[PDB]
Structure formats: structure tokens, C-alpha cells
Amino acid sequence: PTAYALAISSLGEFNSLTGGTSTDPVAEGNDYYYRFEIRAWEGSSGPQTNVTLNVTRTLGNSTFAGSGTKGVDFEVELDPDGPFGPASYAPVLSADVQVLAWGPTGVQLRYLPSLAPGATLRFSLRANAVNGTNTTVQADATSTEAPGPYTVFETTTIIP
Amino acid sequence: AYALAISSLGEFNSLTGGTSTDPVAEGNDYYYRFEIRAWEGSSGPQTNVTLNVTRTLGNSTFAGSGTKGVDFEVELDPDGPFGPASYAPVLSADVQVLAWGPTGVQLRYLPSLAPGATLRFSLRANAVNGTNTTVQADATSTEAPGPYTVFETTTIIP
Ligand SMILES: [Ca+2]
Ligand SMILES: [Ca+2]
Ligand SMILES: [Ca+2]
Ligand SMILES: [Ca+2]
């Protein structure tokens, strides 16, 4: 059997930090947002601690924007019962997310509360579009109990 | 003149609608969803818009022999995010299945894809193992060869 497991998925690119519509391609000089989901297995023995997202630009010239302010540069929402219950995504408190790194090529965010079995976190991250070459980002999820690696690669077409 | 985009939408427990999944338990079916999106600034419509999906890691397989409405679905949103028209299924004859096997599928949309329009592809897979499945999805057209590629990953509970 298995004690703990995590999943990651890309949801694509968006024109707003929360709600709004999907985009890609994006015109050079515009802000756009990446969204990723980290999901705890419903069969997990208990809560998972130090659930971390690490996102790095691998290709292209788009940069993660700003200095890393919650509600502007990034947002983290918790769906407490995931797809197993009718509770919706809601923003978490500022004190629940630690910004371990925030730079143009790389961000790292840790969720401090434990993540219950079946619960899902949605991360939204602001980028600045630059160039006529595709931007690719690698997104990696870990917890103390489930180190992974769990990795996706999302690609954005930037119109020059 | 022309440009295309691709995005992963993650994994689902149904071919259309239902809810998001991942992790998946071994022995269950699940569905990958990908979107190909024509640039709204494109000169004209784009022909032979193709999705190629291949397994890069793990043991999960694309399921069945490639029957529309069972193993895969293609939906068109004719104005994409720029207009309030929704996704609707396309006719069986609008989608050419160039390849369909356990490690690889290739699907071509035969009508031309208008500037700003989006295609959403759903593909049935069989979950096997205690190692992550990774799939590579590539989009191409005649006028925007790309290739444009994403890599989506599924946790399989053994
Ligand atoms: Ca996934
Ligand atoms: Ca819920
Ligand atoms: Ca994309
Ligand atoms: Ca629409």
C-alpha cells in the first residue's frame, strides 16, 4: 500500500490573478498568469506538511514579475475538500504562505498549514511577456512526506 | 502572420465535464485534456491543426482503438476566450485519427481553425503502476509548424 501522495497539474495561462479568462498566445509587454494545482491524495494516511511549489523558467525571456507580494504577484487558494465536496476555492491568509524565493527566473512558495487528504491548492503567478520565442516554465511540487519529484512543463507563445 | 498555442488543463474522471482528478488509482480510466488555441492576430484560418501525444515516462497507456465519443473527444470554441460562445463537439468526419495506440496518439482537425478559436482534446488513458506517467503533447499546423509542446504528469497510486 501507499501512505502519502501528491499530484501536480498545469491549468494554463490567464489574463487575471483570479477569475478572468484563459490566454496564450500573449503579446510582448503584457502581464499574464500561470496557474498550477497541487492535490493531496484522498487515501493519504494524514495531513501533509511543507507543501512547496518551485517554478523555474527553463526557456524564453518572460520573467516572473514584481518582488513577490500576495494578492498582486501571486495568489494561493485552498479547496478544503478538493473535488470530493462542494466547498469552493478561497484565498488563504498571507501568514499561511512563505515566499522562500522570488526572482525573474524562479519562484518558490511554501504552504505552512498542513494539507488534508483530498484538499487542493491552486497557485497563480504573474509573469511579464517578452520576445518572439516560446517561454517554458517547469513547476515542481514536494512535501516532507511525498518528496516526488512531481514536475510539469507549461509553454506560452509570446507574439513579438 | 500565424501562431498557435498549447496548454494542459490536467486530468479528469470523464471524457466531457465531470471533475478533475490526479492522483489516479491503478486499474481506473482517466482523461487528459489539452487546448490548442489560434492567435487572434493570425492572417487567416490555419489548416491541419494536429495534436501528437506520446508517453515519455511511466506505464499508463492510451485506451481503446480510437473511437470518437469513447476514447477521445474534440470540441471547438469558435471565438475562444474573446466571445461567449461555448465549447461544442465537432462531427466525427472533422477529426482524422492518423495514429492511435497505447504509447502514442495523433489527431488532426480537418476544417480550418479561425483566428482566436480554440480546440479542446480529451483522451482516455488506463492508469498502471506506482511510478508517475508523463505525456508530451505537441501542436502543429501547416502555417505554424512550431512544434509547441507541454509535459503533463499523473501520479498513479499502486
Ligand atoms: Ca497532473
Ligand atoms: Ca471542493
Ligand atoms: Ca500554454
Ligand atoms: Ca468562447
Coordinates of all heavy atoms in Angstrom, one line a residue, chain A residues 7-10 37 39 152, chain B residues 8 10-11 21-22 32 133 152-155, ligand 1, unseen atoms left out:
Chain A
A7 N -0.1 15.2 -6.3 CA -0.1 15.4 -7.7 C 0.0 16.9 -8.0 O -0.3 17.7 -7.2 CB -1.5 14.9 -8.2
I8 N 0.4 17.1 -9.3 CA 0.5 18.5 -9.8 C -0.1 18.4 -11.2 O -0.1 17.4 -11.9 CB 2.0 19.0 -9.9 CG1 2.0 20.4 -10.3 CG2 2.8 18.2 -10.8 CD1 3.3 21.2 -9.9
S9 N -0.7 19.5 -11.6 CA -1.3 19.8 -13.0 C -1.1 21.3 -13.3 O -1.0 22.1 -12.3 CB -2.7 19.4 -13.1 OG -2.9 18.0 -12.7
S10 N -0.9 21.6 -14.5 CA -0.9 22.9 -15.1 C -2.4 23.2 -15.5 O -3.0 22.3 -15.9 CB -0.1 23.1 -16.3 OG -0.3 24.3 -16.9
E37 N -2.0 23.5 -10.0 CA -2.7 22.9 -8.8 C -1.8 21.8 -8.2 O -1.3 21.1 -9.0 CB -4.0 22.2 -9.3
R39 N -2.5 18.8 -5.5 CA -3.6 18.0 -4.9 C -3.0 16.9 -4.1 O -2.1 16.1 -4.5 CB -4.4 17.4 -6.1 CG -4.5 18.4 -7.3 CD -4.8 17.8 -8.7 NE -6.1 17.1 -8.5 CZ -7.3 17.7 -8.6 NH1 -7.3 19.0 -8.9 NH2 -8.4 17.1 -8.4
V152 N 5.7 19.4 -13.9 CA 5.1 19.7 -15.3 C 5.9 20.8 -15.9 O 6.6 21.6 -15.3 CB 3.6 20.0 -15.1 CG1 2.9 18.8 -14.6 CG2 3.4 21.2 -14.1
Chain B
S8 N -1.9 22.5 -21.2 CA -2.5 21.3 -20.4 C -3.7 21.9 -19.6 O -3.5 23.1 -19.2 CB -1.5 20.7 -19.6 OG -2.2 19.7 -18.8
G10 N -5.0 19.6 -17.3 CA -4.9 18.5 -16.3 C -5.7 17.3 -16.6 O -6.1 17.1 -17.8
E11 N -6.0 16.4 -15.6 CA -6.6 15.1 -15.8 C -8.0 15.2 -15.2 O -8.2 16.0 -14.3 CB -5.8 14.0 -15.1 CG -4.4 13.8 -15.6 CD -3.3 14.6 -14.9 OE1 -3.6 15.6 -14.1 OE2 -2.1 14.3 -15.1
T21 N -9.1 15.1 -11.5 CA -8.5 14.0 -10.7 C -7.0 14.2 -10.8 O -6.6 15.3 -11.1 CB -9.1 12.7 -11.2 OG1 -8.6 11.6 -10.4 CG2 -8.8 12.3 -12.6
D22 N -6.3 13.2 -10.4 CA -4.8 13.2 -10.1 C -4.7 13.4 -8.6 O -5.1 14.5 -8.2 CB -4.0 14.1 -11.0 CG -2.5 13.8 -11.2 OD1 -2.1 12.7 -10.7 OD2 -1.7 14.7 -11.7
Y32 N -6.9 12.9 -20.1 CA -6.1 14.1 -20.3 C -6.8 15.1 -21.1 O -7.5 14.7 -22.1 CB -4.8 13.7 -21.1 CG -3.8 13.0 -20.2 CD1 -3.6 11.6 -20.4 CD2 -3.0 13.6 -19.3 CE1 -2.7 10.9 -19.7 CE2 -2.1 12.9 -18.5 CZ -1.9 11.5 -18.7 OH -1.0 10.8 -18.0
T133 N 3.2 8.7 -14.5 CA 3.1 8.8 -16.0 C 3.4 10.2 -16.5 O 2.8 11.1 -15.9 CB 1.7 8.3 -16.4 OG1 1.7 6.9 -16.2 CG2 1.5 8.6 -17.9
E152 N 2.7 17.0 -19.2 CA 1.8 16.8 -18.1 C 2.1 15.5 -17.4 O 2.5 14.5 -18.0 CB 0.3 16.9 -18.6 CG -0.7 16.8 -17.4 CD -0.7 17.8 -16.3 OE1 -0.9 19.1 -16.5 OE2 -0.5 17.4 -15.1
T153 N 1.9 15.5 -16.1 CA 2.3 14.4 -15.2 C 1.1 13.9 -14.4 O 0.4 14.8 -13.8 CB 3.5 14.7 -14.3 OG1 4.1 13.6 -13.7 CG2 3.2 15.6 -13.1
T154 N 1.0 12.6 -14.2 CA -0.1 12.0 -13.4 C 0.5 11.1 -12.4 O 1.4 10.3 -12.7 CB -1.0 11.1 -14.3 OG1 -1.2 11.9 -15.5 CG2 -2.3 10.7 -13.6
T155 N 0.1 11.2 -11.1 CA 0.5 10.3 -10.0 C -0.4 9.1 -10.1 O -1.6 9.3 -10.0 CB 0.5 11.0 -8.7 OG1 1.3 12.2 -8.8 CG2 1.0 10.2 -7.6
Ligands
CA1 CA -1.4 16.1 -13.3

